[PDB]
Structures are given as C-alpha cells and as structure tokens.
Symmetry: D2
Subunit: 216 residues, 4 copies
C-alpha cells in the first residue's frame, strides 16, 4: 500500500496547485476594491504618472529618450486582472489601459487598452510566457518617417532601417504579441511584467521616493 | 484636497498590508488539512526522511558529515504555523518537531520540538529576523567530548576548542536562539528557513528526484 | 624557526605584489603600440564610435536617452595609461580623450580630455578608488536651462531641481571628481571603468556584433 | 581602403591574442621561483593544509563531509604550470601533486599527481575546457564497499548505487577526465580551477583568516 500512498501523494500535489490558485483569486478579489479607491485619489494629482514614470530606474532602458515627450502626457493608468472575470484565464492575465493628454499639432488625446495572457509551448520547464494582440494607436505626427503604416518599401535598405526604428519605439510595443521572436519590440514581455508586478502596485512608493529626492 | 488624498493614500497602504496578512492566513488554513493528509502517507514510507535529507543540495553544507549517522535515524518531521493558533504571531512563525529512531548504545529514541518566531530591532529595513529558544536533547554518547554540558573548563585552550566544536554540530543548533551573534551554531536562521520554505513543502519533489537518479 | 618562516612568507607576499605590478607594466607597454596602430585604422571608419556606443548593453543605463543626440557626434576616443609615463602613477590610472563633431548652432566641435587616478582612504579593505578633476566643456545650447553655469539660483526649489538635472547628464559627468559622494554625477567611477576595461579594449568586438545584428 | 583597414584590424586582434600569451608566460616564469621559496616555508608548518582546506568557503560543497577525515592528512600540495616546460601547452595547463600522511590500517601514506589540460570541441564559443587522465590511488579501507575496483556487479540495483556513491567521493574525482559528461565525479573541472586559481595562490590569506577566527 506504498502504491496507494504514491497515488494519494500525486493527488495531494494536484490539490496544492488548486489551493495556490484559490489563494491568488482571494488576493485579487480583496485587492480590486482597494485599487479602485486608490486610483480615485491618484486622479486628483495631475502630474502623478509623469513623475512616477520618469522616476523608475529601469523603465527608461526600454525606450528612446525621444518617446518621453509623449510618455509625459500620460495622465491615467489602470490594470485589471482577467482571472476575476473568468476562471478560464490564468491568474497572471491582465489588461492595461492608458490615457494620454496629447500635444497640439503632434499627438491626439486618446485612451488605449492592451491585453496580455499566458500561453505554454510544452518543452522545457516553461511556466508559460506572455502573449498579446496588437492594438491600434494614432502615432505622433513627427514619427511619420518611422511609422510602419506609412513606409512604402520597408524592404529597401532605407525602408528596412526606418521600419526597425519604428518598431523599437513605445508605439511599436503596442503591436507586440510575443509570437514573432526577433521581429517585434524587444522585451515587450518584461516591460509588461514591470507594469503588473512593479509599477502599478508600488507607484506610490516610487512617487514618494521621487518627492523625497526633491529635498536632500 | 491633495491633503485629503495623501492622508487617504497612507491609509490605503495600511489596508494593503492588512490584506496581505489575511491572504496568508487563508493560505495557511487551507493548506493545514492537506499537510495532515500528506504526512499520514509519508509515515508509510520508512526511509523517506533519511533519503530526502541526504538528497538535498545544500543541507549537507551546514553540518559535519559525522552527524549524518544520526540524521539518518530521523523518521518523522512536522511543521506547524503558529499564526493559526493566535493572531499575535507573525505569519512566518512556526514549530518543528523531529522524531529519531535512535541507535543502540549511542543515541536514544526521542522526539524534540523547537520554536521559531520573528522579531525586529528597528534600524534598518529589517523585515525582522528569526529567534528561537534552546531546547533540551540527549546527545549521542560518542559526542561526550564536545558536549557543552560535560566539558568542565571550556575556558582553557582545549576546553574552548572542544566547546566550539560541539556548538557547530546539529545538536548545537538546538540551543541556537539568534540572540548571541558569533557565539552560536552558524546560520541557525537560514537552516530554519530551509525547513519551512523548502524541505517540508517540497520534500516529495526531492524524494522523486532522488529516486529518479537511482535509474539513469 | 617558525618566526623565520613567518617573516619569510610576509616578504614573499610583498614580492608577489611587486611582480603583479611588473607584469602589468609589461602588458601595458606591449599593448600601447598595437592600440596606436588599431586607432589609426579606426579613424578611417567615420561612424564607428556612434555605432559602438549605441550597441553597448549597459552604457545606456548611465545617461538620459536625450544625451545620445550628442554622443552620436563622437568620432574619436583615445585612452592612455599614465603609469607608462611615470612609476608614481598606479597601473590603473588613465586619461581619456574625446572628440565631438558637433551640431551647427547647438554643439561646438571640440576635443576634451579627463584624467582618472586611484586614491585610498584607508581602514576599509579598499584597494583604493578612482578620483578625477573637473574639466571644462561647452554645453549644448539646448541644455542652457540645466546648465550649472547659467542657473542663477540653484537654491530655490526650481533652481535646485534644474541644477540636479544638469549634473545627471553626461556633461555633469565631466565635472565628476569622486570627492563629494551623493552630490555628483551618479557612478562616475563605474562609467570610467566601463571605458578603460570594456569599451576601449573590446570596441571592435562590439562593432562586429552590431553589424551582425543589422541584417539578422 | 576600407578593405585594407579591415584586414589590418583582423591582424591586430591576432597580435593581441599573441600578447596575452606572452604576458601570461612572463607572469608564470617570474612567479615560479617565488612559489618554490614560499612552499619551502609552508613545509615547516605541519597543520597548514589541514587548516586551509577546512577554512575555504566552497571547497566543502564538493565532497562528502566523510572525506574530510582523509583530506585532513594532506601535508603537501604543489601546482606546476605545464606551459613553462613546453609552448605546446596552453597557459592554463597544470599538474597538481598531493601528499597524504595516511591513517594506520585505513589509509596509506602516499603521493599522487594529476594532470589537467585544455581542449576545444569547436562550434560553441568555448575557449576550451579542462580534461584529465585517471590516476591510480589506494583507497581507504573503509571505502571498500563503494570502491569501483571491488564492486563485482555495479549493474545490479545495489551495485549501481554503490558504484555511483564511490564516484562521488574525492577518490572518484581522481579518475575524472571530463570526457564522459554526467558519468563522472560532478564538476571535477570547477574543482581543479579552485586549486589553480584560488587555493594554491591565496592559501596564506585563507590561513591567516582562519587563525584570525580561532580566538574571535
């Protein structure tokens, strides 16, 4: 009845995995209402996101300094976890919504939402990896020369170069999917994790740290 | 009403911290019953712990190979989380219970339990650190020469050396407290964490890995 | 006897330290002529440095992406080791010389050299740490608002902020000394090491890697 | 022109590689005589190696604490670099010689030397990796049950287990070659590097540190 034991143990492991999911759902449910309250207070501080995003340590490593002109117009960010809507979603799946104030003559005021979900390929310990769907955004006027929608050739030496430059901008990240390795915005996956795991949850601590450095 | 906002945010952080604790209690409560069931099956495999303990990668780094003779007689381990009994305990606080089969003429069959709880010293980010109380154990006959209870001098060059050698054995770990840095069993705290965070929860995975290496 | 031995060993360590210096001098002397030859070939490839600097992995982490506009105009870099000129210099001491092509009406074409030398503070094991002297540079026109030489106040909340922003640019690095911890360009020392230990010696390997990726 | 330049740079890299070898030979030649002098003084301190080997931080991670009984009898270690004898040897190639005092009726007093040399497999960047030849050693009497030369079966479940246990002892390391990955003493290569790069060169610093702790 070592047999019975082994069979029993295998089933217990499965129950452990089920428990971890139940625990995570509990956490996400309880946190949802507090995030909504927090977000409401955030809306009362006009320059909040601009400050936080410029303060983060590694965020800046992902995007050309050129983009910051536009990143500075972000005045709202909201993350929502998809597993709260349906149990068919992995606990790590989420949507992220940005609002931009825009810039006269260059960049339209607009709201955009992107969705990220996990998938597995089997083969290798792989807990599974993030994927996303491209989502439309109206690019800044000045980015017309590296806009993939305006470049006619993108197959010529010059066109190919312009194309790759655009895909390396923040706007190229919006059409990231994780399904064409080496052909999309680099590390779109790690950027997404930065948001769900660091930036959205601890933004206030980042803001405080930034306002602290104003004094010394 | 940035003021109101800031005050509101500070309170929300506090609620976050409360939620994390509530989440942890939920996890520990749900897991308790599964651990009891698992443990029951473990009891049916006589050499389980001996195998697991010899299999772990880093456990061996903590104790003289000499001790393994006695570690091999362990036939039962149980961890219990104190926060389940009272909310005055930190979520990380726990008791650990060992049973030894013993060895004829050298080591008595016996059961011992040690308790670990967190404390903070303030000063430094310190999430707080583990502490424990010494607990009595009957040492193996052959360890008489480095037994702190039998060494008369322990202040002479020879006595001091014998004393330090005994405190570096597994049995010296049992009187570890974490309150006399540099004078007790080295890294008693990290060893304790090995048990609560790795060895007890994932013992089955370690056992399987060990039985897997039997084949190649 | 044991005495004699210990004195002998102490002297041998001293001889080891002397040998390490002798070995380093040999390396630097033999390398000097090859660097000069190599540099001559480098001068024939106009966009060399621009490409290499944009290619390095961690260089970008040190400076605002804004600065790259100007970093891209660097068309010459030369490192020389001061220990070759005098034995009073530590083997690690060096001068670094930059030439910038400039940008009409924003940034003047110019050549600048900075010197770095080791010093010790004693106590802490410290092999000793880098120091430098501030060296004058004509800042880009567009950097006028965060130029420490043009800010009148720099003590008001706005002036202090503008001042700190300028000191965090590449140009602020040029007045780094390592003598006012926390008040100068962050990690000026690690940046200097990047140049002497990685960028200058292995630039060609970085360039190749960059040209390798340009098609992919 | 550009052609000429590229050919010139390729040749300069080759010269760099040649220089590194020349520098290394210089270092090894100058150090040889100091090591001989130092070793002579080391021979006058009977318990030197025992203390040093028990003191090293990570050495212990490689071998069963059981082996220390025998490691404690080492009273002499000598490393020599083969590149000093012939230029056909890589700078990293070396021989290592141990002398053991032995233990009456368990372990014979004896001297053993092993040789390590680099080889390349091509493709993977591989600077090339260490290889060695098995060298005969008379095993301790008590290790008879896991001695590969005494196990008759080593193909039965018990024999296979005994065999693998022996190959994981320090004595199994002596027949390591690096030519049968996963079937020989684990990480024999990293252990060899520990000796040539850390233990032999800095033994004195380790000894001092150990004598420093002996009072604390």
């Amino acid at each position: 009845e070592h047999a019975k034991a082994f069979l029993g143990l295998a089933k217990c492991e499965e129950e452990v995995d089920a428990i971890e999911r139940e625990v995570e759902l509990y956490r996400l449910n309880k946190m949802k209402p507090v995030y909504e309250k927090r977000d409401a207070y955030i809306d009362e501080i006009a320059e909040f996101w601009k400050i936080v995003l410029s303060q983060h340590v590694s965020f800046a490593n992902y995007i050309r300094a050129s983009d910051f002109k536009y990143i500075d117009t972000i005045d709202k960010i909201k993350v929502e976890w998809l597993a709260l809507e349906s149990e068919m979603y992995d606990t790590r799946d989420f949507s992220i919504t940005f609002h931009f104030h825009g810039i006269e003559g260059d960049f339209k005021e607009q709201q955009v939402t992107k969705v990220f979900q996990i998938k597995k390929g089997k083969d290798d310990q792989e807990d599974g990896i993030l994927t996303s769907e491209p989502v439309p955004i109206e690019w800044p006027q000045s980015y017309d020369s590296i806009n993939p929608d305006l470049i006619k050739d993108k197959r010529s030496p010059e066109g190919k170069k312009k194309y790759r430059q655009g895909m390396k901008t923040i706007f190229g990240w919006f059409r990231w999917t994780g399904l064409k390795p080496g052909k999309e915005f680099p590390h779109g996956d790690s950027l997404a994790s930065l948001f769900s795991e660091e930036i959205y949850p601890f933004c206030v601590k980042y803001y405080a740290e930034a306002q602290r450095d104003l004094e010394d």
